[model samples]
Target: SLAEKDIQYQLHPYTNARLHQELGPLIIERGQGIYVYDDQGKGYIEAMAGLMSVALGFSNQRLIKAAEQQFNTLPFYHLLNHKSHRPSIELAEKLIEMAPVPMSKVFFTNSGSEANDTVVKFVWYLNNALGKPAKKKFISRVNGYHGVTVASASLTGLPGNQRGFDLPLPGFLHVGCPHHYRFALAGESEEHFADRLAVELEQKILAEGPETIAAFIGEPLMGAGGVIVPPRTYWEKIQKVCRKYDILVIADEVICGFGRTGQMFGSQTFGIQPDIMVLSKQLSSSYQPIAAILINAPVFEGIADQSQALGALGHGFTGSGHPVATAVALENLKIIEEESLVEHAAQMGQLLRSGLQHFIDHPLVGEIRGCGLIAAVELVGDRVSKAPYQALGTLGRYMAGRAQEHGMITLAMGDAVAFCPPLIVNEQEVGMIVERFARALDDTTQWVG
Candidate 1:
């Protein structure tokens, strides 16, 4: 009855709508620590951390109180026409202070998609102001995930996100994805692979002409693209190419920001120095809809000059810095710093990685790659040939289903099982996750056989 009702009324994203009618949603009613409970009261370990956004986990009283306090103080306020609030001011200042690079300003948005879309507009405005109207093209990797907005969607390089949308309007270009396991030449070292990708990027720039390309965007470590960790020296070489061509670098840290990558930002984890950094997801631990774009001094001055000349920036969301959202984000950042979650994430990440490493010898496991609290186990039909199963993502989907059946939650992209627990996860909880995932893998193997 509930399934029928859901099918009748709801349209879900990234779902096979027709098939979903047969399998009802697993409606989660509440969560605590690392576990979320379905409406039926069955518990599942939230291995994916509520779509990789709940860094502090669910049931954090501090966040709840933060929202309550903000609601009572100033429920809502619009940041338009020079109007401002304390929460917005403090959060922006804090974000600028914590930025991995030298940031001169922070612009807030409601989500990563909005933040990315805003960045595109900012880039266009800056280029126009600098008298390079032709420099409007953007380059992203083949599997990089940006967002779902029209502009941001074009920046996303995944076909699934673009298929029926008729996306990638005009000047959006995609280069090689730096996934050594999937794309590397035989016997090539990681450094060589990085170099090859770098050369390819340079060639693409030259082919398109540097004057026409505005920026190159990428995630420090690919998230939705099977949690792909770039090859060693990948960012180093990629940055060099961008610099050589005078292209602005945008780091999409929506999933890798906060403490997910051991460091406060994935840029720190991967040594990426981006000109514009996108932040969201864990900024307020997903308690509120908020995202931001941090810009360097030169970009700030460029955009500022244009805004002054035009008498207005002519861009911003009504909820750009909603007082309640910013207040929660400020408190979220405070908790992270007070708890030293960055250091804790680094320590726990090693534990999680080591625990997963135990399964490397499993017959179905092809590779286990990640850093900090985020990781993925890529399954293969044959280890030696590295061939995928006939039904590509079926095995991983089955494993994920079995994991849920085993009271654990995980995400599967193709044959890669993604594990990203809350940053507050402890060693014991990490052990349980490994054990639960191991059992799920065993069950899936049996089913496959």
Candidate 2:
């Protein structure tokens, strides 16, 4: 009944309409801990953490209480003009203090898309203020994902995001992806790979004229773009190039932020000093739809002076810094701190990584790579040649379905099976995830055979 209702009335975000008409929808009715239940009450381990946003997992009572108290005290409020609320002010202060680099301000939005989309506008505004209107171009990696908004989608390097959309507007330059496994040549070391990418980046900047480039944006490790982990020295070299060109570096930490990468921020994990950082997903652990953009002092001052001269900032959202959202965020951060979830994530990450290493010899597994609770097992036809299956997404989709049949939920990004369990996952749960995934892999191997 629910499937019929969904197929008739609801349109999903990233689903094929024809497939939905046939296979219908799998309706999840409830969740607790790292497990969710379908309409028939079948339990499945949420390995993807609900799109890698629910850091604390589903049904966090503390988060619910935080939202409840805020709603009761002040059900609705906006962060517009001089009007502000206690929750928003406190969350901003906390974020500024917790920022990896010296940040002067935090701008809130309802989602990562809005935060990244806003960043483009702010960059334009800041450059205009500094009398550098020509500095409007942005360089994003070929596989990096920012968001789906017009400007953010342009920043996203995935072809799917831009295909049929006539997107990437103008001035959104794309450089080489940093995925060493997929792109690196034979005999190329990790450091050399980083150097090559850095050289390529510099060449692009010079070709486009450095004066026209405003910023370079990236995730410390690519998320939706196949969980790509950059080679060693990658961030260092990338940062050097950005500095050489006076290009602002924006770390899109939507997935890697807030303990997902073992560190409080992915910029810290990758030893980056971003002029601007976009954070979301885990800020409120998806308990409330919230996101933030942090800016360094120079960027802040530039925008500040611009707004002063213009008499207003000229940008904001109605749900920006919604009181209830900020309140839940404050509580979420507190839980992360008090419970030592970051350290737990680091420990559990080690367990998960070692467990996944067992699959290194599996026929379908080409590579097992990741940090912390985020990882991916790239499926391939031949491990030696590193050749993928004849049909992409075939083995991957089969493995994902098999995993679901085994009561484990995961994502199939191309041929990579992405695993992102909640930060609250324990050793036992990690073991179970690997065990179930191993079963799914066996089933896939049989299916392929």
Candidate 3:
């Protein structure tokens, strides 16, 4: 009945409307620890951590208390009119101090999409302030996932996000994705692949004229575009090119921030020194709606001078710096620190990866790729052909459905089945994940045969 009602009254994102109407929805009623239940009380281990969020696991009591305490004191407050709240101020301070690089300031947003959208505005404002209005183009890699807003979506290189959307508006450029297995030439080494990407980037810059390029944005380990990890020297080479051409580097850590990547920040894990970093998702462990953008001193000074001259900055959200959200984010960071969950994630990630290695020889497994706590196993119709699946996501969706029946939820990005358990997950939980996934894989094998 509930699923029928949902089909009648609701429109789901990324869902096929026709199929949803035919099959209805799998309505999740509740979540605790690392599992969620449907209406029938069937519990499924949330392997993808509910879109790579839920870092502290479901229903963290500390987070609840933090939100309640802040709401009681300051239910709603904005940073407008020079007005501020204690929670936002404290959260900003903590974020800056915990930044992997020396960040000069923090700007609050309501989601990763909004945060990235804000960065585009800020960069444009900065360039205008520095009298380089022509430097307004953005460069991202093919298959990278930025966000859904006009500007951020244009930055996203996935075809699904842009098809028929008239996207990638004017100046947004895309270079080759840094996937050695998927994109590298025959017999090419990892280092060479990295080098080729750097060259291709430089060529795009020179072709477009570097003076028109404002920034390059990437996720240290690509997430929504199927957990693609860039080559070992990828960031090092890309950053060098950006610097040589006076382009700002932006790291969108929406999925990789707050210990999802073992290190406190994915930038730290990948050796990225970005001028700007956009954070969300795990920032509040999805307990609250919150995101923040960190800008280095150079970017800060440019915007600061422009704001002073104009007598006011022209960008902000009504929900910017919401007190309750900020308070929860602050508490989430404390829990991560107090529990040393980052280190724990590093250890559990190894266990998860090693466990999945057993499936490397499975008939349908093509490649197993990941880092820290996030990983994916690309399913193939034929190991030699590498599947690319021909039918694309068909195999992944089938496997994911099988996994759910086996008591686990997974994110099927095309043919790559992604696994991102909560950072608080333990050895036993990780073991359960592996076991359930194994069953799903076996079922898929039988179905395919």
Candidate 4:
């Protein structure tokens, strides 16, 4: 039965081809609750929860049923420009209504990348609309992960996404990631670190020229940047600097939104008051590929006024508001609300964080950082000096494979491994995650030693 399936037919993202030949995918055939079964029928705890999406599990019948219902009714439609649909309109209204802050409007996109790309275009559009064409540069963190599009990829500061591609695209800039363990200077307290980052960010903005800068985007807690939570007073000062420069704040909540950070949105988790907020991942729990942007009333008004003056706004996608996707998302949101998933995430999330802290004191662990359900355990050879393993890439792969052997699927991100299971994960599954993770670490430490 297993031999009948051909995985080679599909192209896998984020996998090395030559390596895949040596080690084929684990091939999960089915999932129930928090565990997925491999083709061989062996079960492993899905700790990463399908790239940290899937707030609900894989076998959630509610989501599947919703999809079926929408498919039967109005399966396909377009939301480009003047055309509108009931599902799109309803979803947008719900998103704005549930915004943590005063939000004016919603813009739909297919994924986080498209949503962020929209932000990039909006920044340029806003500057030009305000009669300041030179104000077009965008700043993101040195280790931030936005997306992989031309503009959004430019906003992303990760080298693997930029090198050979020749990105940063002339107008994009980066400040230090608020990763204290990696970037903090000797004798720098958390407050001092925050202040130092604030100064550096302001310096970059000034160097770039405020009149030539349009926006600053950041993840509330750096997700792809190794779960680097900002230091105390970080957002306060950064917000002040942005306010002084008139650069709009864009919070990329692709990972932190939708109860991942104990709150409904990352903006609430952190003290970020963004002009625009991007959402995806858990919005529909990966039942559908959908994302939406929330804009503050003033920003919406500015764009509206500019469009009216210019006689056109000029943007949207064909599947920007697919009826089936929107229906699934709506139902998903309802489930999240009625079940109090946010509060549940906060409690269970604390258990996970505290449980993982036992490893923080481990000699090979440089840092253990997280909030709510999202967490990262940064591995290192020298914890005292916070030095990464001598062979980081190989070391990372080794640990990931070892984790799989231990019956858990953890994501190896650089020298750190991330953990973000579904919201439905219970105490027993969380314990299993802890146990399997420990086994993986122990196994890897032996190999490295």
Better of 1 and 2 by lDDT: 2
Model 1 ranges off by over 4 Å: 1-3
Clash counts for all predictions: 0, 0, 0, 0
lDDT of each: 0.93, 0.93, 0.93, 0.86
lDDT of 4 by residue, 60-152 (tens): 889899999889989999876577778888889898899888888888899999999999998787777778999988889988999999989
lDDT (tens digit, per residue) of candidate 1 on 10-67: 9998899878888868788889988899989999999999889999999889999999
Model 3, 138-254: lDDT tens digits are 999898999999889999989999988899899889999899988999999999999999999999999999999999999999999989999879999999999999999999999
Residue 292, model 1, lDDT: 88
Instruction: Decide which is better by lDDT, 1 or 3.
Output: 3
TM-score of each: 0.98, 0.99, 0.99, 0.96
Per-residue error for 368 in candidate 3, Å, reads 0.3
Q: lDDT of candidate 4?
A: 0.86
lDDT of 2 by residue, 319-355 (tens): 9999999999999999999999999999999999999
